[PDB]
C-alpha cells in the first residue's frame, strides 16, 4: 500500500498521482530507475531498488546490460521486476544538467519510458525525480520536464495503455515541487 498525496487527471485519462514513498515498493506496472550508460545502479533510486530487489533485480540488470549494450543519452531500456512489487524496471539513462540539449533530452528520456511501458502494455509507471539526483537537475526543472513529456506523450500517442504515472518521491521538498508543477498540467 501507499497513499496518493495528489492526484491530476489529465484530460485523455491519465492520472498523474504524486506519493511519498520508497518507490521500490510501489507496486506499479513499471518503475523508472535513473541510471546511467552502463546501467549503473546506485544513487537514491537505485539503492532503494536494490535494496528491494536484491540479487535477482540486479542480475536482471545486468543481464540487460549485456543484452543492450550501453544506454544511450534518453535512452531506456526495461528488465523484470525480480524482487521487486514492479512488474518491469525501465532505466533510463538521463542527460546531465547543462548538457546542450539536456531539457530536450530529459522530455526524451520521460518518453522512452513511457514507449517502452506502453511497448508492454502497462497500466502504470513509477518515476523518481529523474536527472535531479547526480545528474544534477534542480528538481523543479526536472519535474517541469518530465510532467511537460508526460503530457506531451499522452496527447501524441492514442494507444497508450498507461493509466497512472506515479512521481514517487522521497522527500517533502520534491513532492511539494512535483505537485506545483503536476497541478500546472491538463
Given at each position: 500500500?501507499?497513499t ?12 498523474l498521482?504524486?506519493?511519498q ?39 536482471a ?19 523484470a ?67 511537460k ?8 500517442t492514442?494507444?497508450?495503455?498507461i ?14 515541487i ?9
Open positions: 500500500g501507499f496518493v498525496l495528489s492526484t491530476k487527471s489529465l484530460f485523455l485519462g491519465q492520472k498521482q504524486v506519493v514513498a520508497d518507490i521500490a515498493s510501489i507496486d506499479s506496472d513499471a518503475v523508472v530507475h535513473p541510471t546511467n550508460t552502463d546501467f549503473y545502479i546506485g544513487g537514491e533510486v537505485g539503492n532503494t531498488l536494490e535494496k528491494k530487489g536484491g540479487k535477482e533485480f540486479v542480475e540488470v545486468l543481464e540487460l546490460r549485456k543484452k543492450n549494450g550501453p544506454l544511450e543519452v534518453a535512452g531506456a531500456a526495461v528488465s521486476g525480480h524482487g521487486l512489487p514492479a512488474k518491469f524496471v525501465i532505466h533510463c539513462n538521463s542527460p546531465v544538467w547543462g548538457a546542450d540539449k539536456c531539457e530536450e533530452l530529459l522530455e526524451k528520456t520521460v518518453k522512452n519510458c513511457l514507449a517502452l511501458a506502453d511497448d508492454k502494455k502497462l497500466k502504470s509507471i513509477a518515476f523518481p525525480s529523474i536527472g535531479s539526483g547526480r545528474n544534477g537537475f534542480p528538481k523543479q526543472t526536472a519535474a517541469q520536464l518530465i510532467l513529456a508526460i503530457s506531451s506523450y499522452f496527447v501524441s492514442m494507444s497508450s495503455s493509466k497512472t504515472v506515479y512521481f514517487v518521491l522521497f522527500d517533502s521538498e520534491s513532492i511539494g512535483y505537485v506545483q508543477e503536476m497541478a500546472k498540467l491538463d
